[PDB]
Symmetry: D2
Subunit: 268 residues, 4 copies
């Protein structure tokens, strides 16, 4: 485990789910990993289990928590090589009339502005290390998703912002890339399914959304992140799809509330 | 009907299906339309019905038919403003081991090289008119399709070649664009469905592949083509999707022969 | 001029630039056009010149202005067929350390949340009319842009949100599409150039960014919008590029502050 | 070096350039590498230098050479885990009127049909091993390139065919992915530059096409390939861009033969 030995890595939302899979991936590569999370429980458990990981309580929507996160990372470890902006939320399914501008703003604070604020504060140090930024976006930023207008918007912004940052930071040799996971089996996925009338039917539909026939694992996103940080030196501004092929081929897109005619009038 | 008055337009495969929808769209816009088709029946019927359309028998895989097509178009009408490369075939569903290199080559001759050969012979005249090329590709060139390796490859080539041509021909102000239809209800679609064990179930699945809940119509591709030729003067090298949103959102991609686990092991 | 006769169309930011080009395009197609703009001068001039256009002062970042815009549109004209979310701003060039979270939020309010709020309030009426939404995004949402992190992010969100809306609204047959202009010669473009040390050198570089060798015109975006509203009935969730081919081919991407080695060490 | 230990890997065109970089990457990961190349010199040198690599003379455009390649690979090593279709050619710059249908066909034989034929013959064994296919396409398949219509077309086909194969082979858990390199410093790149009036000016323009300010290295493509084969188990049908960001941001796209107006008429 030496492909990223000695590098200092900040992972937001690293207490569980994809974040924890990324923390473990970088630890196994030899990095010093600073777990940023608003929830103490998961981070402390990872901090105690993994020696290379330390936990720093930090809500990325609070400018002062993030400034303290960066300040403590430099003071305690002297450098910063990689920022993985993973902290993010997916609300329950909401139709457009079931969304509010206030909830949209709240979601932007977390999914977009938290990623922006940490990136900006980290860039002075990433420039000195010739480090790199990895944003965790989502496939639905590229292809849309039903009943998720605010969420889809925040992820479209993250993917685009990744490319803008890659252009701004290329003169320092600082790479900025993003991973777009499709359906990854995580506590978030499980919690959203548990809100549905038939949780396991929902999970099964999520599995059938991939030609590979399953959801991904946090560990597979984690391997994608370590590859971007440690072995993708000619990649900047890319969108690495970790989706099981969900974007490929024809599927079933007409919804249960969507008027569809019988097959004797195929084109209306 | 004057948005493309007086322009000379060649439409390959214009005897039926999307081609005929494009012929009718351009005729209604005021163009002189040369129907190129290997089948006399459909072209002659369109030629007789539509005064602005004439029919010239031409198999686009035969270099001499195409050279005669261009030569006759200039001799009879003095100019050439728009080439719509629409002639193309989709074979029945074939697994990769059910394809041959020889059939692939045959399909390349039609779907790709016929489009290439007419474009090359037309370019001297398109340059004088500051005309434009419109290639009919397919959505599956961008997202893939099951059981269609040779077909998907030819359409990936057409879409890419469209962009290469747009770069080569931009110094003459000749635009080169493509339309990528998804599922369009045509005689080709009907013939392929009729080979399946349950034709109407197949048609219905094709309808459900779109969030809009239906297949498109040749007339809707035809309107897209007239827009590209007549009102899209700042568009070159674009891929205009006419797909009903089939590429959007999560669907059902794990095939009936694809081992999928029960939802108690969601990520393998 | 009848391809959109009798339809009621709201165009935000319609007082000048691309917005005015869209207003004129829809008026010429026969629509009733409600010009929404925060600046009275341009809207009143268009309102007085064009009979089919009326002006309603409205700042799209103010929820009450938008609610009054929709309320007045229905009260005065009885229906709503098309919403063109065009109001938007591009700040001067700013490096990431020259951006603030507060300016980002302000830009999100205009470029994203104003588009969201009007869309949500309009959807009850668009559903009754089977109308459609057209968002004006930008090419840089797809490919990034230097010195424009907040702007690029807002446009990435708009493009993605377009696709989410297309999925949510497809059961009503309401289409939701976006246009991504590249470099369009507008007062905004002129004002940004005028901030540069060499305005005309900047304009010239903007012209050279396109294989076609020029910037686009508001009228060309306007024609793209009328096509989406009136003749693209099988298009939903698409990104219509109006860019002159700026995304095509290799160009010059290493910036004047970017360390580039001599050509005797080509790969570092 | 154990991330791909014991796997049998066929690399076409592995004698030099990107192919050799991929051979070395897989050897260092522990694989048994079968170098396929039409040129004995480079392959024999790699075979002798690297113990895990053996060389089998094979022209991928000859169906019998490929059938013998697969037959010998199984007979000598009992299995097949990964096929890297890298063999390919880029002709010198050719305008469309400087291309022939015959040269296009020749280029399709190598760039597309050689990749197709080996893939088809390999699939029975890849299915037993749950292996994977990696195609080396190109960025210009996605964004076009000037003076390269036949080349661009072949790479558009490869990228699309990759996605079709990913759908067909997902029920066996066989992944099919592609890498799209941008400008990689290779003997091919050097040979093409040496045909230009100013080779080093050409190389320099190739370096300036990337925001990172350099071309990539075969080793960086090689690391991307090992990642796809060994650690990307939830990726299928993806296009992994190894391009230095060449696709990002605005550049200089109006060619030296392209009429461009002075900046006092910016939009024509
Ligand atoms: N799970 C999927 O299928 C999926 C798909 C696409 C994208 N994603 C994205 O991946 C990321 C992780 O998703 P997940 O499924 O692992 O989620 P999760 O809920 O399982 O884990 C998210 C973690 O982030 C932390 N977090 C949340 N808000 C925070 C804040 N304000 N400050 C700091 N930490 C905060 C949580 O406490 C938690 O530990 C998110 O950005 C999500 O949008 C997930
Ligand atoms: N129908 C769809 O859903 C769909 C989807 C995506 C792309 N497309 C593409 O659109 C085009 C038209 O498809 P369609 O469904 O209308 O097909 P179709 O079979 O209904 O019509 C094709 C026409 O082309 C003619 N043609 C065939 N081979 C020819 C040749 N060698 N020379 C000259 N003319 C020839 C046929 O005689 C026929 O008139 C094709 O390129 C097809 O691949 C269709
Ligand atoms: N000009 C380009 O090259 C270009 C490129 C890509 C995208 N775009 C987008 O196209 C749209 C129009 O751009 P433009 O160049 O015509 O700009 P512009 O500045 O010339 O015109 C914008 C109009 O919107 C109005 N507006 C601004 N803020 C508003 C608010 N809060 N409420 C209501 N109206 C408001 C302005 O008063 C003005 O009339 C924007 O969304 C912009 O981001 C433009
Ligand atoms: N170099 C770049 O910048 C670049 C960019 C994009 C894509 N690519 C692609 O990457 C691949 C390798 O490119 P490269 O620059 O390393 O090329 P190269 O010329 O340096 O090496 C290609 C190798 O393939 C072998 N080969 C050629 N024809 C063959 C045949 N018929 N059968 C077997 N082997 C054959 C050659 O002998 C040589 O060893 C090609 O597919 C190319 O199109 C390269
Ligand atoms: C299926 C699987 C999913 C999902 C959503 C779906 C449903 N898509 C349908 C197509 C548009 C309307 C609904 O979100 C995560 O996994
Ligand atoms: C559904 C609808 C279609 C179609 C194909 C399908 C089936 N897609 C499944 C996902 C990959 C395996 C099979 O071709 C035209 O319309
Ligand atoms: C050229 C033309 C433009 C532009 C920006 C550029 C500059 N691009 C370079 C590549 C990345 C660093 C800078 O914005 C509008 O028109
Ligand atoms: C610049 C760098 C390159 C290249 C090509 C170019 C030139 N592009 C210009 C934009 C279209 C017309 C010409 O091929 C490899 O590296
Ligand atoms: Cl969805
Ligand atoms: Cl399919
Ligand atoms: Cl830029
Ligand atoms: Cl180019």
């Amino acid at each position: 485990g030496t492909r990223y030995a000695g590098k200092v890595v900040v992972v937001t939302g690293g207490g569980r789910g994809i974040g924890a899979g990324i923390v473990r991936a970088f630890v196994n590569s030899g990095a010093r990993v600073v777990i940023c999370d608003k929830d103490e429980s998961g981070g402390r458990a990872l901090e105690q289990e993994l020696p290379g990981a330390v936990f720093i309580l930090c809500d990325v929507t609070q400018e002062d928590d993030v400034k303290t996160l960066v300040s403590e990372t430099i003071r305690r470890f002297g450098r910063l090589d990689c920022v993985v902006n993973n902290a993010g939320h997916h609300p329950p399914p909401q139709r457009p009339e079931e969304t509010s501008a206030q909830g949209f703003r709240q979601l932007l604070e977390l999914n977009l502005l938290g990623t922006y604020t940490l990136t900006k504060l980290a860039l002075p140090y990433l420039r000195k290390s010739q480090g790199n930024v990895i944003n965790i976006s989502s496939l639905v930023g590229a292809i849309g998703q039903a009943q998720a207008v605010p969420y889809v918007a925040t992820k479209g912004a993250v993917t685009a912002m990744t490319k803008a940052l890659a252009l701004d930071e290329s003169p320092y040799g600082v790479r900025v890339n993003c991973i777009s996971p499709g359906n990854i089996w995580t506590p978030l996925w499980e919690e959203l399914a548990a809100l549905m009338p038939d949780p396991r039917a929902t999970i099964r539909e999520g599995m059938l959304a991939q030609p590979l026939g399953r959801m991904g694992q946090p560990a597979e996103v984690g391997a994608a992140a370590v590859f971007l940080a440690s072995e993708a030196n000619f990649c900047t501004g890319i969108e690495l799809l970790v989706t099981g092929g969900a974007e490929l081929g024809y599927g079933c897109k007409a919804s249960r509330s969507t008027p569809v005619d019988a097959p004797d009038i195929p084109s209306g």
